[PDB]
Amino acid sequence: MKEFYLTVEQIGDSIFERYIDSNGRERTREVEYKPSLFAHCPESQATKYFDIYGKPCTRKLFANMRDASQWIKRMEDIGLEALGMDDFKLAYLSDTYNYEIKYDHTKIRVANFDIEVTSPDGFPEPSQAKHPIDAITHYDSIDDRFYVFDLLNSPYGNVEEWSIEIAAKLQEQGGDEVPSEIIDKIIYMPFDNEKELLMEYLNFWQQKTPVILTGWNVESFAIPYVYNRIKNIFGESTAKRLSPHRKTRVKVIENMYGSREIITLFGISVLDYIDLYKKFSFTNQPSYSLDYISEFELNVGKLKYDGPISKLRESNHQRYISYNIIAVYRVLQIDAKRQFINLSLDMGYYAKIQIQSVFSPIKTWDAIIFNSLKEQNKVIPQGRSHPVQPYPGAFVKEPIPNRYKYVMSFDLTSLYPSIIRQVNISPETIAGTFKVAPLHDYINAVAERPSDVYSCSPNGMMYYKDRDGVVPTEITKVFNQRKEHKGYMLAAQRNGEIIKEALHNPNLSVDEPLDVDYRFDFSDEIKEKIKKLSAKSLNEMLFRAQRTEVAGMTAQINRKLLINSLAGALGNVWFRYYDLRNATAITTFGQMALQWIERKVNEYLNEVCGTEGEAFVLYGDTDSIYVSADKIIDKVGESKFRDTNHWVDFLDKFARERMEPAIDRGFREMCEYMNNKQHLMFMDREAIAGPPLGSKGIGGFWTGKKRYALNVWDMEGTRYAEPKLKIMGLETQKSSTPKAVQKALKECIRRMLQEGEESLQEYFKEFEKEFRQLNYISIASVSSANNIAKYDVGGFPGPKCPFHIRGILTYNRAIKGNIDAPQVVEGEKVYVLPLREGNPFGDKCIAWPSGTEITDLIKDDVLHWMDYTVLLEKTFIKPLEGFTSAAKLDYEKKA
DNA sequence: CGTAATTAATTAATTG
DNA sequence: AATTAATTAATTA
Numbered sequence: 001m002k003e004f005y006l007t008v009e010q011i012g013d014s015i016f017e018r019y020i021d022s023n024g025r026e027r028t029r030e031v032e033y034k035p036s037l038f039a040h041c042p043e044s045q046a047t048k049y050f051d052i053y054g055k056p057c058t059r060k061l062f063a064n065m066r067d068a069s070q071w072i073k074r075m076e077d078i079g080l081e082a083l084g085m086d087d088f089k090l091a092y093l094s095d096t097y098n099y100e101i102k103y104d105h106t107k108i109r110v111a112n113f114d115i116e117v118t119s120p121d122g123f124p125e126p127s128q129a130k131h132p133i134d135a136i137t138h139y140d141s142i143d144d145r146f147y148v149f150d151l152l153n154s155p156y157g158n159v160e161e162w163s164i165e166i167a168a169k170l171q172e173q174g175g176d177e178v179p180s181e182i183i184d185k186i187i188y189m190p191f192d193n194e195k196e197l198l199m200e201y202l203n204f205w206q207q208k209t210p211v212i213l214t215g216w217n218v219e220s221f222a223i224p225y226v227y228n229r230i231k232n233i234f235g236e237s238t239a240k241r242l243s244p245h246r247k248t249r250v251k252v253i254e255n256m257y258g259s260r261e262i263i264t265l266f267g268i269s270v271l272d273y274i275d276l277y278k279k280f281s282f283t284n285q286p287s288y289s290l291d292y293i294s295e296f297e298l299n300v301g302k303l304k305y306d307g308p309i310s311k312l313r314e315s316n317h318q319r320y321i322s323y324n325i326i327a328v329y330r331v332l333q334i335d336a337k338r339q340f341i342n343l344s345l346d347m348g349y350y351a352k353i354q355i356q357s358v359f360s361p362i363k364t365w366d367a368i369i370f371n372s373l374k375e376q377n378k379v380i381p382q383g384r385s386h387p388v389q390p391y392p393g394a395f396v397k398e399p400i401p402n403r404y405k406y407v408m409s410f411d412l413t414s415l416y417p418s419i420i421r422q423v424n425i426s427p428e429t430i431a432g433t434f435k436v437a438p439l440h441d442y443i444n445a446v447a448e449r450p451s452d453v454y455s456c457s458p459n460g461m462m463y464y465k466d467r468d469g470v471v472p473t474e475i476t477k478v479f480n481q482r483k484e485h486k487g488y489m490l491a492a493q494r495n496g497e498i499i500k501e502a503l504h505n506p507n508l509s510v511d512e513p514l515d516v517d518y519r520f521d522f523s524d525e526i527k528e529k530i531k532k533l534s535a536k537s538l539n540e541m542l543f544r545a546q547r548t549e550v551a552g553m554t555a556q557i558n559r560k561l562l563i564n565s566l567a568g569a570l571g572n573v574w575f576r577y578y579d580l581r582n583a584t585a586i587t588t589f590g591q592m593a594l595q596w597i598e599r600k601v602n603e604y605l606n607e608v609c610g611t612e613g614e615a616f617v618l619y620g621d622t623d624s625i626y627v628s629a630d631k632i633i634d635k636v637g638e639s640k641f642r643d644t645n646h647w648v649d650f651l652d653k654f655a656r657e658r659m660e661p662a663i664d665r666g667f668r669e670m671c672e673y674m675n676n677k678q679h680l681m682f683m684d685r686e687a688i689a690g691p692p693l694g695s696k697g698i699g700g701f702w703t704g705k706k707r708y709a710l711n712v713w714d715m716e717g718t719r720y721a722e723p724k725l726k727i728m729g730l731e732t733q734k735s736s737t738p739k740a741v742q743k744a745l746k747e748c749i750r751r752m753l754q755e756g757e758e759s760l761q762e763y764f765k766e767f768e769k770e771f772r773q774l775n776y777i778s779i780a781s782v783s784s785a786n787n788i789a790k791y792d793v794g795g796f797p798g799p800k801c802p803f804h805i806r807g808i809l810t811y812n813r814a815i816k817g818n819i820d821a822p823q824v825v826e827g828e829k830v831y832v833l834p835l836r837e838g839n840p841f842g843d844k845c846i847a848w849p850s851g852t853e854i855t856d857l858i859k860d861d862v863l864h865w866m867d868y869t870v871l872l873e874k875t876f877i878k879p880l881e882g883f884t885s886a887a888k889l890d891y892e893k894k895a
Numbered sequence: 896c897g898t899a900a901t902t903a904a905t906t907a908a909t910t911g
Numbered sequence: 912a913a914t915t916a917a918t919t920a921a922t923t924a
């Protein structure tokens with residue numbers, strides 16, 4: 001097998017590399033890498049190195065990395081461009097791995113761990129690490145074992161050994177319910193004192209040094225805590241042994257009185273799973289406790305205990321250790337499902353960056369582009385300083401607020417990267433400019449044809465057609481990868497719905513789930529077999545389909561983010577190929593494409609239909625159009641339909657056979673009009689939406705831009721077994737909306753679109769009757785807590801203090817002089833509740849850290865002073881008022 | 896050190 | 912309540 005790197009670092013004039021060799025064995029080497037950079041040279045100098053603009057460059061080979069770096073500084077001061085990859089580890093990696101990397105994950109040491117620290121005086125700050133580490137569980141991917149380091153004796157208590165027997169038993173049975181599938185994988189090690197525990201953990205770490213270090217919050221708690229505790233007890237050089245090169249860097253953050261740190265461990269790539277989850281999951285969560293995320297992703301129960309966590313070891317060491325192990329295993333479970341580590345390795349190795357650089361689209365693209373250009377013996381430009389400037393983006397149509405009964409939407413395939421490729425937008429493909437007519441004139445095809453020679457964008461930019469830009473070239477490759485995974489995801493999704501259909505009529509038999517790969521559409525033979533399966537076999541198959549869909553979702557949506565990020569990167573001053581003309585070309589072409597196709601669809605739909613000048617396109621946003629289908633249904637006649645699936649079939653056929661071909665012809669004209677390099681504006685039907693046939697449901701509605709709801713029966717080829725609500729922007733979608741309110745408003749929308757006005761009125765009353773009985777957490781608002789210090793005036797709200805900060809300031813006054821009540825962390829999320837006037841908290845609202853029961857000392861008071869009336873009006877009634885007024889409905893029977 | 900467009904909620908001040 | 916502006920948070924794309 002071909003070699004691949006694990007980690008790369010620059011220490012002085014040396015590159016330190018851990019790698020897998022041709023026999024699949026982990027190795028380390030130190031290389032005195034001699035880098036190269038380039039300067040522009042007179043034409044009269046024969047060479048093989050040119051910049052992206054085809055200007056001649058001469059290579060300077062340096063004795064070592066410091067002198068290359070020194071050369072750059074020198075070139076800045078003179079004002080002469082120093083060209084080349086100035087990040088030397090990428091340059092090194094590009095030389096040492098002169099090929100598409102094929103990697104083997106089973107050889108990569110992936111490690112997650114977490115630690116427990118008992119603290120009788122509040123949060124144990126990693127920067128002081130003054131309390132003993134009393135448990136560590138460290139899972140090693142290569143061994144596939146959980147190494148459990150348990151402290152038996154501590155200042156805060158001497159405890160008995162942990163029983164794997166009791167651990168294994170379910171909680172019903174008085175056990176700890178450690179999943180049976182990992183029981184046999186636990187290697188348990190108790191210790192007499194903290195010193196040998198830590199010493200043994202160090203040697204262990206030396207034997208089994210992580211390449212990928214992960215876990216939950218490990219970068220901000222576990223890593224810095226372990227590092228500092230070992231430092232205090234043993235000394236810094238001993239703590240440096242966590243780096244396989246005995247080098248670390250401590251980053252210090254703020255913070256008036258507060259101080260937290262982040263350790264960089266040279267020779268390891270840290271991918272904190274919270275950070276992976278925030279970047280790659282495409283959710284926004286009310287809370288980021290592992291308990292909250294585990295429940296969300298895996299549907300597992302919260303890790304319940306009695307007393308505060310600072311007394312859990314003391315009172316129930318057994319559960320203390322079991323919960324430590326499970327916590328570690330839950331992250332593993334989440335990744336088994338989400339597959340983010342895998343995604344990181346894929347992207348990292350494709351780009352030839354340090355794996356931890358996947359968090360950075362700019363860094364990622366810089367390497368991809370560098371490698372792509374290096375292969376052709378071309379030289380990359382030097383990074384330049386730019387001022388930050390606002391620039392124009394997408395077009396959003398103003399909709400008429402209303403109910404819309406039948407709606408078909410259409411959306412463009414991967415729009416921005418498609419524009420990049422169609423127009424040939426790249427730093428080196430710029431050809432010139434033309435005189436700019438109003439966008440409106442290009443939309444209406446009345447403006448003069450910009451160029452007969454070059455590929456054009458309505459912002460005035462012209463690009464060469466006769467060669468390919470590095471940006472179109474490299475975005476195309478990732479796009480194709482994205483396309484493949486999306487294919488796998490949609491088939492998995494379609495397969496899911498087939499299984500869902502089959503669950504309506506489950507057969508009474510004893511059978512097994514079928515052995516199938518879900519990334520592929522079921523064969524007819526398979527579909528026949530599915531119709532004779534039992535619910536048990538069907539339900540298990542469904543779970544597997546859904547799991548396959550999720551993996552395909554991860555793979556496709558993150559590749560989409562990467563490619564869409566290149567379009568954005570053109571507008572970030574830190575990107576080497578930053579150019580606002582190129583960013584503008586993309587967005588302005590986009591604005592044209594959408595409005596252009598709006599005109600074309602209306603024109604078409606007026607011809608068929610036999611109408612004159614009706615606006616069929618009700619709404620659009622960036623790359624999408626929403627088409628009122630009422631008149632399409634009208635022509636054939638609503639009474640002509642047997643059931644819902646009949647008119648859904650009808651519209652589906654009409655879009656596929658009539659609309660898409662008319663749209664394609666429309667965009668081919670535009671491409672010719674802009675003289676583009678390649679036609680790639682592909683717009684296909686997305687949603688078919690409407691009320692169930694024969695019902696009083698309204699089907700859908702808009703309140704304004706970026707705010708609507710649709711009852712969808714078919715989504716880009718997936719025919720649902722049950723209609724799904726497509727709700728965008730509305731409070732049902734916002735993480736700041738109370739949990740119970742999100743559900744109530746969703747059922748409200750469901751009744752409106754599927755059942756009608758009378759049904760809505762029934763639910764409203766029922767919810768209102770039950771509101772005061774719901775759990776206070778489920779009805780609390782949520783918000784991020786930024787700038788708490790800015791508005792804190794002696795514990796009281798300063799000028800312009802936001803409601804949610806006011807709440808935090810009310811919290812902080814309530815918990816003064818109290819050690820074991822949890823503190824609100826700057827930047828984190830908080831639950832928020834209104835308080836009735838005359839409350840003893842002295843203010844109108846209170847806030848406490850999200851994902852946690854409010855501390856017992858004031859829970860009783862908060863529950864009693866909650867303003868349910870304000871709460872209901874603010875979070876539930878006001879949003880519904882907006883939905884219903886837009887849809888011309890009443891939530892209460894009007895007098 | 897991917898982007899812009901857009902909403903809703905809330906504070907301050909003003910609307911004779 | 913009802914604006915206009917400014918800030919903050921959170922979406923859609």
Ligand SMILES: Cc1cn([C@H]2C[C@H](O)[C@@H](COP(=O)(O)OP(=O)(O)OP(=O)(O)O)O2)c(=O)[nH]c1=O
Nearest residue numbers: 411412413414415416417560564622623898924
């Ligand atoms: C989601 C997203 C979209 N956009 C812009 C660029 C997209 O091409 C355009 C349309 O967004 P989308 O339609 O959401 O995505 P897409 O067209 O790029 O990909 P798909 O094939 O699944 O439809 O909006 C961003 O700039 N950043 C983003 O994060």
Ligand SMILES: [Ca+2]
Nearest residue numbers: 115116324327
């Ligand atoms: Ca814990």
Ligand SMILES: [Ca+2]
Nearest residue numbers: 411412413414
């Ligand atoms: Ca799209």
Ligand SMILES: [Ca+2]
Nearest residue numbers: 505507531532
């Ligand atoms: Ca059946």
Ligand SMILES: [Ca+2]
Nearest residue numbers: 411412623624
């Ligand atoms: Ca879209």
Ligand SMILES: [Ca+2]
Nearest residue numbers: 411413684716
């Ligand atoms: Ca599509």
